Assembly symmetry: D2
Homo-oligomer: 449 residues x 4
């Protein structure tokens, strides 16, 4: 069930299956705060970084090939998600993320030992690296991957479902609403083209932050000077990471001091996620209001059943609230760096990576299980638009503003269309024909589809 | 490996079809309810079964089976039987159904057939259950865990205020040299911030402890006994000892809004603000030693201030969670606020983080701090800020000359006065030591 | 047009060289102190002069001149004499010096020479004065203006809860059709939210009313009489009637932090959250008429312009709350240097909530009218009310009644009759008792 | 003193609808800022030009609006806009305010204008105020914020160059670390401001989108089909702001204000960067006796009043950012009704960051002086620099040197000599702190 690990202070107990060592177990017992550790994306990124560092240390003749091959093989297993249960240290740890860095070095040493290769976690696995430039690098690798490989395709899937609805509902005329009050006609297609643009603009916002989100601190070592690392370590590690992941957005930082003293790229990326959360709130709110009732609500559309409650718009608006909250935590940590190091990295990493994950997963669900299956109450929508006092204005040049206001008043009272009220009031004659009436009251033409 | 329901459910799972459908419908965060939430749902279901039995609405064999199964859930024996994502239907009905289904499967193992809705959810609705369990969990988190954790932090800071009562040092305003203070006076300030934090938590309890139970679907209590709420609350108070638990003052406000969670989050956010100031000052006091302030030494767990860093990161998380809670709080509609699982997640996490980090900070940082007493006194006695009480003896020009020479020669104000030959008829050595008494300048009680 | 100082100062200006240097140093927002902050600085200076006179530290002619000048400032007679930007030295020392110089110039017009620092700032420092005036202003804003404004809003919502006690309607959960409620019950919920809002403001007053006065530069009270703080607070409470004003429990906490403002902002933020829900429901209730819910009619000032003013004010309070907490957390050692920014935000939040709550109560809530027949018709036509028919016709026939009622756009009562269910098993009296929607709402 | 229309002040150029809005919203006692009033004047002048070009508005009427709108854009009528910021969420009241003021200016010149029929021709109550808001925000970003940030970047970069060899000890977790230069730290601050400019520039394609021509619900009903493109063309030619565009989607441009939320995010990130820069500078200037005493701030000892103004401004920008996002998310169907509140907060954030960045650059950064000898002494006395001695005296002796240096308050170099310990040239090469900082 358990095994004993030793260090200079004494002994610690670790689970039998654990690949971490005494130093990681000391960190576990030093930080019992949340009971929540690193996510799979952060763990993968630490694996990718350690493998790339071993490759570069081998290329520069600084690390023996047998040792480099063992690190590269161990780090590939971590990057493949084979050791997601080997990172037990709390998110709320030493602000540089040094404990999680040491945790990766210890797990790699234990994997290589199973294959008969002895690695020193610090001297070999952390060669040319420091306690301060490793965890922020893995954070920006994970955030860049989350943006490019997962969030942008998920948002594109949502944009395509909204755009398909904009096309399908192109002529589905309805009454507009401004200040929640009756307004001139629109189409359901036009409203959905608006939602599609919000998601398209969301993708543009994510893409615009990538030149700074993809900046890596690797090679800057303890304070950003690069002391105790080869002069080209950073450019070489980044080259290996780009070739292996296909993430061309990964780059060396423009300034090695800014890359460690601050995490401004995460604050910037969080702002884009927060704007997407704001867009999603508007889209989800309109959709659940459109599907409200049926008797006591708007009853414009029908949401797919998973009393049909709008459970996916509720999941979307709750996710948006979480992204807003995480955004405030990220900015707070971001502003409070000091001199050569910002020490809020594990907290900032947790929040940014969670915001990417929640937006990715909820956007795919919302697109597939809500948007794709929406059905419109076409006749009900057209009836309300054709019954609106807002459409009596094009009758003014035929019957006058006084008679047009009388038509509007009677239509509301008798719950009839403007067309039927004009007929019932005996206004069809030489001054206004039935064809002229239908042209003047063409609600689809008023929406200017 | 799995079983078929009228969906495929894992063989060792105690949940049934409705939970499995919720698992498939919401793969969003991959994180479900925490232990405190699961415990509160167990507490609520047991109290409801007790009241339904007391009112003769539920058969004793059925009631006993629910009470026994709910007690196991409240005891933390089934924390792996709640797989539904936090980001679910906004009323928390999925987690409510998850509890009813798990209770039905526990009772079935003991040969008692329970209908999850008709028996386990008897006199309850899909809307008054999850907010009740949320306010039970938040009230317990405040009373049983946060307040004792904050009291332990207050006591450690107050013990330091007492121990360092005469540890004179120079004050700092705008980060610049100021008149003397004691390290004890600064720590009395931190102790007051935590004491005020406890007062803030206590002040929110009359509204945090309000439970919606008995209001059913829309707050009217339709399909529940008229006294269901008062009876359930009486059972919960008797069993938990949590006297802060009460029926809501208004049953409509208790379901249409979660304002009690927004209010409680404000108190937690204020504590996070206080903890930021305390932790920042402590890591700055322990900074260096050569390039910093080197006022104190933090216990080793290069001695980095790792617990002040854990405290300030926790505070940032509490600030963030607070913004998410208020956002959800404001967006209720008509008879129901549908942001409850998200609000519950954030408020309960803020209680947990502040509880655990306050205890760690008190025990593993504050308790073991040591002051560089001689260094602190020498800097206070060398400060140009203390030349003002010399003015009435040597004039403000000569006092300014003393301040300038003391800084240049890196000497105390006392030594500079001696070195300038100012001891004489106009100023005796006893008069100088009385005028430059830095501890008396701090005016410690 | 101007006068020379040892700096060019405008001719009709009562401020002096230090204020003019501060005007030149901080051209950031173009916005100075508000009337409430100027008032509190005047109140503080007059109370300090009174205590310095009482202790024999300040000559009577000098004390009388300060007391007379400070009462003019507290009365709002010199609101155009405080030009320093909100974004100034974080202790608020510039605005403290601004008050001392304006008092000196007022006294000079009456032939009394006052030294702004030696006389007007006697027994005080650059650091315990502006936070004291801030907490005086915030306490007065809470007690004299916000709580009465919220009480007026609670009273208007409670009057509507009473008037609409029997106005039955259909409930809404997740925005979908639910069992009956009354408009009165919903408004009793809104009234409780505002009543709880008042309780929240009252609960923060023991810490909001704490004053730093007497703590001087670092909280030790050095260069002030030992009882200066208790005496100044005694004068302020006797003269203003604000009994919530008290000396700080800990003089170091009172200057190193502004946690009382962070706490008070939390209460204002919760009220903003409650007001958002109340205003959103009211504008949705008044929506349409054709394309909306058309439950009520809002008074024309028909766009819901007051609910829009309320929800925008609430957004501002949320924003100001984040700025206050940010400043609150970033104190260092003996002094929090974010006081003018924190003061600006907390006092604006008090003002906006006060003014919009009065407007909302008088010009929106008081004049609301309900579409009583429309509300009852929808409740009586809801499938949600077929459940009490189960013990007479069975849940299958009850579901068939619900389906037909929706399709034919009829009441449940009419559908039961049209389906020929009135007979020996169910009389017309038994049907009306079972489908009594007001009784289903279970109003008190 | 007052005229009847409602009682309106005699010298006021506004009319009955503005007076009713003054009476309806006594909430904050604060109206539109000069930038907002200017943008409304620019919009009305461009609309009159296009209505004249399309033959829809008589030349005498068009010339009168163009002249009156030019006076408003020039800041000649900033006292004629008394409606509270907290008004009808579309900003329709401030739109009518502009139409009424233009009508009264034209009347003084003998031209009768109908505020709605002429001044609001081809426009609605809903596409005008968001257009003026995005014009004002785009101008604030391009003409004022970016040049102010460039001024701050240039002052920080000049310090990074001047202090290129000013070696000092690094600080990580606030603890003693290996050497850096004051120039390297200032190059970091300069990059943060340079990245800040990139962040503002990246939001301009969406911040510059204007709703004009969308009318009531975004459909363009009761406006010429090319009204929007023509108005935008006139505004670009007259302001020189090539960033002003027609919206990509006319419905998104009125149902949401996502461009303001996005721009606020960039301003919030700059506030975050400025907090770090200002905090480091006031800590560097702290003491002198009880602090770090690394640099001396110019006097306006010396309190860091400009870093305090910067950190307070940053807190305000953070707060305004939360208010903007809150308003941004709560739109409904065809219109987001939080525009005046969002406009107030975004334009204030632009103004505060603009003004404080110029002050911080000119009156703080430019005049900073470094305590060069003190900084080098501490770096040369640090136990962090004993590591390059290990290959000469061993880790045990190198630790003994570090311990004795701290106790006797001496340099590592002096302690090595005092312990009788490796030539003097080899020692100076091994303990070269500037070489350890590896400056380019």
């Amino acid at each position: 069930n358990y095994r004993i690990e030793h260090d200079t202070m004494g002994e610690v107990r670790v689970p039998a299956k654990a690949l971490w060592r005494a130093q990681t177990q000391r960190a576990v017992e030093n930080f019992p705060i949340s009971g929540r550790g690193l996510e799979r994306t952060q763990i993968r990124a630490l694996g990718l970084l350690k493998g790339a560092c071993a490759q570069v240390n081998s290329d520069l003749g600084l690390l023996a090939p047998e040792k480099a091959d063992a690190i590269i093989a161990a780090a590939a297993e971590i990057a493949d998600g084979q050791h997601d249960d080997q990172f037990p240290i709390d998110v709320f740890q030493t602000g540089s993320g040094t404990s999680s860095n040491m945790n990766t070095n210890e797990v790699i040493a234990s994997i290589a030992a199973k294959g008969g290769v002895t690695l020193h976690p610090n001297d070999d696995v952390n060669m040319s690296q420091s306690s301060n430039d490793t965890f922020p690098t893995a954070t920006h690798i994970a955030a860049t991957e989350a943006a490019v490989a997962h969030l942008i395709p998920a948002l594109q899937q949502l944009h395509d479902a909204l755009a398909a609805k904009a096309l399908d509902w192109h002529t589905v005329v309805k009454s507009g609403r401004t200040h929640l009050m009756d307004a001139v006609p629109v189409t359901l297609g036009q409203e959905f083209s608006g939602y599609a643009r919000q998601i398209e603009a969301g993708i543009e916002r994510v893409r615009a932050c990538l030149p700074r989100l993809g900046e890596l601190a690797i090679g800057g070592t303890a304070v950003g000077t690069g002391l105790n690392a080869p002069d080209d370590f950073g450019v070489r590690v980044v080259a290996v990471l780009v070739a292996q992941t296909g993430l061309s957005e990964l780059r060396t930082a423009a300034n090695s001091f800014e890359a460690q003293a601050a995490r401004d790229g995460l604050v910037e990326a969080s702002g884009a996620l927060r704007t997407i959360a704001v867009s999603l709130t508007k889209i989800a709110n309109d959709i659940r209001w459109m599907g409200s009732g049926p008797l006591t609500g708007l009853a414009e559309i029908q949401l797919p059943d998973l009393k049909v409650n709008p459970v996916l718009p509720e999941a979307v608006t709750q996710v948006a609230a979480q992204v807003i909250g995480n955004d405030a935590a990220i900015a707070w940590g971001g502003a409070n760096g000091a001199f050569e190091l910002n020490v809020y990295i594990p907290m900032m990493a947790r929040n940014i990576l969670e915001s990417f994950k929640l937006l990715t997963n909820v956007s795919r669900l919302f697109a597939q299980r809500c948007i794709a299956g929406l059905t419109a109450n076409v006749e009900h929508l057209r009836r309300l638009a054709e019954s609106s006092p807002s459409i009596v204005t094009p009758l003014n040049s035929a019957i006058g503003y006084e008679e047009a206001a009388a038509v509007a008043k009677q239509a509301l009272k008798e719950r009839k269309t403007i067309r039927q009220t004009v007929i019932d009031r005996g206004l069809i004659g030489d001054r206004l024909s039935i064809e002229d009436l239908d042209r003047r009251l063409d609600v689809l033409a008023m929406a200017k589809a």
